Amino acid sequence: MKSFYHYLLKYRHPKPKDSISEFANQAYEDHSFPKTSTDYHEISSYLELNADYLHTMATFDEAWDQYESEVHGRLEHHHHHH
């Protein structure tokens, strides 16, 4: 794994467009983000803990799917025989 915050740092999206993009800029301002702790359940509640992220829960879930896909996926390609 690699600090979800840092992973997100790669998507600073200097020009928000997609749901994940707008979220990235927002998270950048989250100086309190649990950089030293990445857990779906723990962080999930962190979002619901504030209506600010409540209106974009679908984005976080989607982001996670991408995150794990890059880490939990690695060079273990299977479905795509390319």
Rg (CA), the chain: 13
By three-state DSSP, how is residue 23 classified?
Answer: helix
For the stretch 41-77, what's the b/e string if a residue is b when 16 or more beta carbons lie within 10 angstroms of its beta carbon? Answer: eebeebbeeeeebeebeebbeebbeebeeeeeeeeee
Q: CA 79 → CA 62, 73, 76, distances in Å?
A: 20, 11, 9
Instruction: Sketch out the chain's domains with CATH numbers.
Output: 1-72 (1.10.150.260)
Cβ contacts of residue 61 below 8 Å, gap of 6+? none
Alpha helices in the chain (DSSP H): 4-9, 19-28, 40-48, 51-54, 57-71
Instruction: Give the method used.
Output: NMR
